[PDB]
Amino acid sequence: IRTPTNPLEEFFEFDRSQDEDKPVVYGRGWKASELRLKSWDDLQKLWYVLLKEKNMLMTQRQMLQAQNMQFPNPERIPKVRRSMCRIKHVLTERAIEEPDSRRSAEMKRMV
Amino acid sequence: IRHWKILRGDNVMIIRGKDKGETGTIKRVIRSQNRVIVEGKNLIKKHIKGGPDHEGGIFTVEAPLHASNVQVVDPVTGRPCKVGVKYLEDGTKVRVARIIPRPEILKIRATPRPTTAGPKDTPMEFVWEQTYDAKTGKGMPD
Amino acid sequence: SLDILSPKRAPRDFYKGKNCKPTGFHTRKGGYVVQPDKLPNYVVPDLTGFKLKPYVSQCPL
Amino acid sequence: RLGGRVVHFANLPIKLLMPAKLTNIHEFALKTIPSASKIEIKRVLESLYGFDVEKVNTLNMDGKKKKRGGLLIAKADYKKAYVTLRSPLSISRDLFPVKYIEEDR
RNA sequence: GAUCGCCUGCCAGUGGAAGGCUUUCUGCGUUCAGUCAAUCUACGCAGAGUGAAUCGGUCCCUAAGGAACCCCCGAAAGGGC
RNA sequence: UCCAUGGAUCUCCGAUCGGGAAACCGUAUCCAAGCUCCGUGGCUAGUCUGCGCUCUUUGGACUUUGAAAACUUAGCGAACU
């Protein structure tokens, strides 16, 4: 049950490495085309997802370094950040087109 | 750009070490020291103490040596001086003697790829292009 | 090194700030009139597109 | 163009420190980049995580700068913020490695 | 922890401006500093710490003044208004 | 990873819109011709028929300021010796 109620909880989730396993496999970051071929809404929702993730991760990092000075978790932030980069890039790219007042306010609401 | 002509794994023969005369597969290629580690070649005994990891005593492990001190074997078993190039677009680029062309050992993956996860997005959620645009525009923003 | 000044180390008559917070008049009698107009307001969307988990998969095909 | 500054992608890397070494809390502590206002953090932690904050205050420290002569190495510029919830929230002791590894000592 | 002292309208108290700029605190340590043998700290490492419609700045004004324009004057700079 | 090309973002002072205690604090117009947007008048409601706004963007003209070592050519112009 991975259901984080209590908005405080958002800054973390999922007690890692339960009784006997390494659920330490955490996948790969998004890629250029994989992001290219998506819609605007699901794009920005993936965005805020990455946001909440970057938040939880930085919070993990500094909490651990401060209190126990260990931080066993490996870095996941570069994939999170650079994927935010790619989102922003595909947006700024599908931005340009013919109509002025449309392409403007498109780039604008992006940047 | 081709700064290297000795690849991971391929059979090689020794020169000039304290153990001149031996053939081995190169376990690692340190590109910084211009050096390589070859199986069972260049043994050396480390003293080590380590508390948690049970680093506990003499370890006979293999340490590198300069690439200008190994040369690779052939189906004549010696000198290739294998510099070579056969740029014909029918392959065999690498490893021409000074005759026999080997295109690497084809190891392909150093680290295994995980075959599951929960926290992870199911594979691309099955790449499906999610109506980015199909009718020359749909999926656009408001 | 104590390079360029910064209000943390100055006399009480110093003001630098952090460069982007323009949200009102600047009142005459030493106040501040924060309008509603110039306040950041966000089109953040609801429960997000859920099939989009935080990062893509490594499971080989 | 309804509201002038109409944002669409907020990117303030809010980093909560820890509850007050507690389990049911009225107010807590962020540490963000040194350009996060009160109005901002209010309208964003209301609008993205669904908090309900009342008093938003922000003491503004700086980084731990260590030097050995001319060799100076510094860090970021925190903006430690305190935020006050209208009705206390709770934290389960097992959310993560954190808050039991920590509460050990 | 305890007896004993010294200060109590400019060497010893209280809130602090000017100045310092982590020197405050928390754990670890004692290589360096301490006018010792230092387990101690204003010392090294590690970590945390400063919340303010009302305080003090910000801001409005002007004094002493420094300049802007125009103007006047001077080989150049620039000076004067 | 990496090379080459070409594209995206591209914080601040120096500084050049105003202030400034360098790295910080304050901020477009005019006019045409563009859908949307927001009431207005039409009473004749007829594409139900028409006016006048705005935020914006294009596309102009208004809206405007640049630095170096030595070299050169000049203006000044000294004492030691």
* C57 Cβ under 8 Å from any chain B Cβ: yes
Q: Which residues contact B20 (CB under 8 A, 6 or more apart)?
A: B14
- Both tokens assigned to D49: 């995580």
Resolution reading in Å: 3.9
Euclidean distance between CA atoms A29 and C60, whole angstroms: 15
Euclidean distance between CA atoms C8 and D76, whole angstroms: 15
* Deposited experimental method: cryo-EM
* DSSP structural state of residue A9: G
A62: number of Cβ within 10 Å: 17
B79: number of Cβ within 10 Å: 13
Are C41 and D5 in contact (CB < 8 Å)?
Answer: yes
- Both tokens assigned to C51: 């099939």
Furthest C-alpha separation in chain C? 70
- Residue in chain A nearest D8 by alpha carbon: A109
Give, in degrees to the nearest 5, the angle at Cα D2 between C44 and A108: 65
Å from the B105 CA to the E26 C1': 58
- Both tokens assigned to B69: 């001190």
Are B123 and C54 in contact (CB < 8 Å)?
Answer: no
User: Which residue, D14, C36, B119, B113, is CA-closest to A26?
Assistant: B119
Residue B63, phi then psi, degrees to nearest 5: -110, 150
Partners of D91 on chain A (C-beta within 8 Å) are: 6, 8-9
Residues facing residue B45 across a β-bridge: B60
B118 contacts B124 by C-beta, under 8 angstroms: no
Q: What Cα–Cα distance (Å) separates residue A89 from each residue in A54, A94, B44, B131, C58?
A: 18, 9, 52, 19, 23
Looking from the CA of A70 toward its CB, the CA atoms found within 13 Å total: 8
- For residue B30, the SS3 value is strand
- Both tokens assigned to A28: 């790969």
The nucleotide closest to C24 (CA, C1' atoms): F26
Partners of A10 on chain D (C-beta within 8 Å) are: 49
- For residue D59, give the amino acid letter: L
- Both tokens assigned to C37: 């107009």
Residue A4: burial class (beta carbons within 10 Å; 0-12, 13-18, 19+): middle
The nucleotide closest to D35 (CA, C1' atoms): F11
Are C43 and D8 in contact (CB < 8 Å)?
Answer: yes
| Beta strands, E only, chain D | 6-7, 24-32, 53-58, 66-67, 72-73, 79-90
Residue B80, phi then psi, degrees to nearest 5: -100, -25
- Parallel, antiparallel or unpaired: strands B65-66 and B35-38: antiparallel
B78 contacts B14 by C-beta, under 8 angstroms: no
